[PDB]
Design a protein around this ligand. Structure first.
Ligand SMILES: S=C=Nc1ccc2oc(C3=NCCN3)cc2c1
Ligand SMILES: S=C=Nc1ccc2oc(C3=NCCN3)cc2c1
Length: 567
């Protein structure tokens, strides 16, 4: 006999509710912006405009009763709490002593960060990415960078997810000392200062909440009331489409590694470890953690930092304490959590960590088998070669000899193979090692013929400085160029060379280059041929697979070649 309630859809936040509460119109400290709740707070306004209102209401989701309260007027606000994310058919019933009247059913959304309230993501992948039937046991990883969504214009739905087992999401910073972030310029340190207000030193934070959970993406169907937007909501819809895809946050990275050096203090580690646990409880679509400490012992962005006695033991203690915390998350949730880590592979980086000790705690080690040479100095080299190139001096490859002063080589030359070998010799199992491919080149200006010691090898010349170019040609910073930029603007469709560039390949190193004799522009990179050699090298040794850095810079060719070389 009471009038059936009508739901005030707009008075009820359009029936979009959430276990996670996120600031949408603000940029502030992480703890101010992100609050995870065990139970979602649901607030539903309903009206009874004509007839009698009755005295009590009940709320049903999919026929189960989940709340009751008093009706006292022609307008009621039902507030209550609910613990499971998902879409539900909601009915509200108004009751009196003579009977009850149900509202017609209406869909209520309760978001959770596993994406249970979302449809599978809709893909928009360059069709230049082919299909493969690569053994599901082989690792095919890549990094997807948070800021890729700006100028580079590359979003989660552009990733060829069917050709990937692991997405590493770069990068999650740590609060605390971060001078190295400052040195980068832009808003980057400022944004980190903001994110860290009200947050303890050594805890993880989201760097760019706009890219991560605020930015509305039409292709994902985000609209004003959607409680989770940005890269994270798309990666949640992505997990719905490909539930076996591992998505892993990458913590640290080149410029974000300054706080790792205070991990020689166990309090700092405990703080960090506990913030990582909270982070994974907050963002349930993530499947583990990746530590990119560049680098234990030093030799990274922070010139004033690095302890070669203590950093290694701290790294190993860190991996153990992470795996302990991850064991508890597996306990509480029933899921498998992965612990991985990207590492430098120069002899001088390797010798500072007992990796055989650390790896027992870990699922994989992403060997950063790139950046061997680059625009930081005027010495050309293959940045991502497998083997020693022709340009190397006698005894340089193994570090047995002397340079042009007659100064002794301190250790084996920087090559992929030399790195993998050093890790195998320490006792790291082959099947935990993932070998890295570059989706970009590094480059130089001013390596003209008059500089060569061998007239057919520009790797024997001398540079004037870093390669300069525009973002239109894929140069996002000095000395670095996207692979798709090399292909469009230097190689051309036939891989023969265009705009003054020639294509060369060092068969001994397994490394391509492009060279413009007159500007002396020289770019070292990975192409189809050398990725095939890497896949072959990986098969040969029983390596876990391949990964790449970074996915937005590929046109399809590098990832394709990754799958082909593993076949
Ligand atoms: S991303 C960034 N990565 C960087 C940025 C600057 C850097 O400087 C060194 C260095 N090597 C010897 C003394 N200092 C490494 C290094 C890595
Ligand atoms: S992006 C870029 N990343 C890198 C990666 C490795 C690097 O090494 C140096 C260096 N500086 C003096 C001797 N070596 C700079 C540098 C920048």
């Amino acid at each position: 006999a009471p009038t059936a309630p009508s739901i005030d859809m707009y008075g009820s936040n359009n029936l979009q509710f959430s276990k996670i509460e996120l600031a949408m119109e603000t940029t502030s400290g992480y703890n101010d912006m992100v609050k995870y709740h065990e139970l979602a707070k649901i607030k539903v306004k309903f009206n009874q405009w004509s007839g009698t209102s009755g005295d009590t209401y009940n709320v049903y989701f999919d026929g189960v009763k989940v709340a009751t309260g008093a009706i006292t007027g022609s307008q009621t606000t039902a507030s209550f709490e609910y613990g499971q994310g998902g879409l539900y058919q909601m009915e509200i019933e108004a009751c009196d002593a003579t009977g009850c009247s149900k509202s017609a059913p209406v869909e209520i959304t309760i978001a959770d960060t596993d994406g249970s309230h979302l449809k599978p993501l809709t893909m928009n992948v360059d069709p230049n990415n082919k299909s493969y039937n690569t053994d599901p046991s082989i690792v095919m990883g890549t990094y997807f960078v948070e800021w890729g969504i700006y100028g580079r214009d590359y979003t989660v739905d552009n990733m060829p997810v069917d050709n990937l087992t692991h997405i590493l999401y770069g990068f999650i910073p740590i609060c605390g000392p971060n001078e190295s972030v400052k040195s980068v310029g832009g808003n980057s340190f400022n944004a980190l200062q903001t994110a860290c207000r009200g947050v303890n030193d050594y805890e993880v934070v989201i760097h760019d909440p706009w890219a991560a959970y605020q930015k509305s993406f039409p292709q994902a169907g985000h609209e004003y009331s959607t409680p989770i937007k940005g890269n994270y909501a798309m990666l949640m819809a992505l997990k719905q489409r490909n539930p076996d895809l591992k998505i892993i946050p990458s913590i640290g990275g080149g410029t974000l590694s300054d706080p790792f050096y205070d991990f020689v203090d166990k309090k700092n580690r405990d703080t960090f470890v506990a913030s990582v646990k909270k982070f994974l409880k907050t963002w349930k679509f993530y499947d583990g953690v990746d530590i990119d400490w560049e680098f234990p012992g030093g030799g990274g962005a922070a010139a004033d930092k690095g302890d070669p006695v203590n950093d290694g033991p701290a790294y190993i203690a860190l991996m153990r304490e992470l795996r302990v915390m991850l064991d508890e998350l597996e306990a509480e949730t029933g899921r498998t959590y992965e612990l991985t880590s990207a590492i430098g592979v120069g002899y001088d980086k390797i010798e500072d960590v007992d990796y055989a000790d650390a790896v027992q705690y870990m699922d994989y080690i992403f060997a950063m088998t790139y950046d061997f040479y680059g625009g930081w100095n005027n010495v050309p080299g293959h940045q991502t070669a497998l083997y020693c190139g022709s340009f190397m001096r006698p005894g340089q490859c193994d570090g047995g000899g002397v340079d042009e002063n007659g100064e002794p080589y301190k250790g084996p030359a920087y090559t992929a193979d030399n790195g993998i070998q050093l890790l195998l010799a320490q006792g790291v199992p082959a099947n935990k090692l993932v070998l890295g491919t570059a989706m970009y080149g590094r480059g130089w200006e001013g390596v003209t013929p008059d500089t060569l010691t061998d007239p057919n090898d520009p790797m024997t010349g001398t540079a004037t400085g870093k390669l300069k170019g525009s973002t239109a040609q894929g140069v996002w910073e000095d000395g670095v160029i996207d692979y798709k930029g090399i292909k469009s603007f230097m190689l051309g469709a036939n891989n023969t060379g265009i705009n003054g560039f020639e294509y060369g390949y060092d068969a001994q190193a397994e490394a391509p280059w492009v060279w413009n004799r007159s500007t002396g522009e020289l770019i070292t990179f990975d192409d189809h041929r050398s990725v095939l050699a890497k896949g072959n090298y990986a098969k040969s040794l029983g390596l876990a697979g391949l990964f790449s850095w970074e996915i937005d810079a590929d046109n399809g060719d590098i990832l394709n070649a990754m799958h082909e070389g593993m076949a």
